[PDB]
Design a protein around this ligand. Structure first.
Ligand SMILES: Cn1ccc(-c2ccc(Cl)c(CNc3nc4[nH]c(CCc5ccccc5)cc(=O)n4n3)c2)n1
Ligand SMILES: [Zn+2]
Length: 352
């Protein structure tokens, strides 16, 4: 069955790597925003999350939809967990200078996201009109984040998310997360947990974000340090993740008229994939020749998650992305059946 999956992956590789002026239109827009933000008092320390993440694609079937993250370092940050949610936090300050750069967004001890987002939108709003280069128009749809969405000409779309960066130890609710010890090693888990973490808005609560960790794992993904560095140990982890992402997008596109799959997104698929990486830590369990079987492990596991309504966040295991209060039974049963139909029909959404 690996023949059809290879073709899907090769078509997908060709649209990725095909010459496109898109990422260059995005970089120029972003560079201007960053310069204008930087000469403002609240945003002096603003920058891009990854330098080279102008062409950062969440949607693997839409090469004109980009997603970028602007970060702002918050020293001496004081976090308070909201309502035992494990993942949502009030942000207050230890306060070294009474007025650090973010003072103008406080309400009491607590940092206001809505007010910080409003000034961020407005500054960006005042630089879009200033643009003489290309056709740029922004759209404000609710949710909190992705905060600002810019449309460059007819096809190019960019989501801009503002995130706070903290360089201190990850919050206690991550303690039992990142369960990579038996796969990538305990040492690697330590090195990654020494990296910063982020907070995005989503009640003026912020949500922990570990965006930046996926690139770190995906580029160094084997139990063997030489995974995918020769022909004797080529594995299919990356391809399985891409095929899972493309499955959800195609299903979401096929059923955009109904509402049942609106709660699901690629991070649900990413999460479930990395849980299978923990379950199956050996490179031999990810042999390239076994693409078809391995993809089926991933599908099977994700379907198990839907039916039991349990999908643990990868960093904060007590958080169930599939709880009833987050996604109702109807939605999960609808997705379960659509995937079964794909699985038992040699995945028709791939040849279309
Ligand atoms: C986009 N959204 C909206 C809401 C949340 C959310 C909800 C609850 C929690 Cl408890 C958290 C905690 N924060 C969080 N959880 C993730 N999960 C992954 C996917 C898995 C992964 C990623 C990289 C390496 C290995 C596995 C990507 C990511 O950036 N985060 N960030 C995040 N997320
Ligand atoms: Zn590999």
């Amino acid at each position: 069955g690996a023949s059809k999956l290879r073709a899907v992956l090769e078509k997908l590789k060709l649209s990725r790597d095909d010459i496109s002026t898109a990422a260059g239109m995005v970089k120029g827009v972003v560079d201007h925003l960053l310069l204008r933000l930087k000469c403002d008092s609240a945003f002096r320390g603003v920058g891009l999350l990854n330098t080279g993440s102008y062409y950062e694609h969440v949607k693997i079937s839409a090469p004109n939809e980009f997603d970028v993250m602007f970060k702002l370092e918050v020293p001496r940050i004081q976090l308070e967990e909201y309502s035992n949610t494990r993942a949502y936090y009030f942000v207050k300050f230890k306060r070294n200078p009474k007025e650090n750069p973010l003072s103008q967004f406080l309400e009491g001890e607590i940092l206001s996201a809505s007010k910080m987002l409003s000034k961020f939108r407005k500054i960006i709003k005042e630089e879009i009109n200033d643009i003489k280069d290309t056709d740029v128009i922004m759209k404000r749809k609710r949710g909190g984040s992705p905060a600002v969405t810019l449309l460059i000409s007819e096809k190019i779309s960019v989501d801009i998310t503002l995130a706070l960066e903290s360089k201190s130890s990850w919050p206690a609710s991550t303690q039992e997360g990142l369960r990579i010890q038996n796969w990538l090693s305990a040492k690697v888990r330590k090195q990654l947990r020494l990296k910063p973490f982020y907070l995005v808005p989503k009640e003026e609560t912020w949500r922990l974000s570990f965006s930046h960790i996926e690139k770190e794992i995906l580029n160094n993904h084997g139990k063997s340090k030489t995974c995918c560095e020769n022909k004797e140990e080529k594995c299919c982890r990356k391809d399985c993740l891409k095929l899972m992402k493309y499955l959800l997008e195609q299903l979401k596109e096929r059923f955009k008229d109904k509402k049942h799959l609106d709660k699901f997104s690629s991070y649900h698929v990413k999460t479930a994939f990395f849980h299978v990486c923990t379950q199956n830590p050996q490179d031999s369990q990810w042999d390239r020749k076994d693409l078809g079987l391995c993809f089926d492990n991933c599908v099977t596991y994700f379907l198990q998650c839907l039916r039991t309504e349990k999908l643990e966040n990868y960093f904060i295991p007590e958080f169930n992305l599939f709880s009833s209060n987050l996604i109702d039974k109807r939605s999960k049963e609808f997705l379960t059946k659509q995937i079964e139909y794909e699985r038992n029909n040699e995945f028709p959404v791939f040849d279309e």
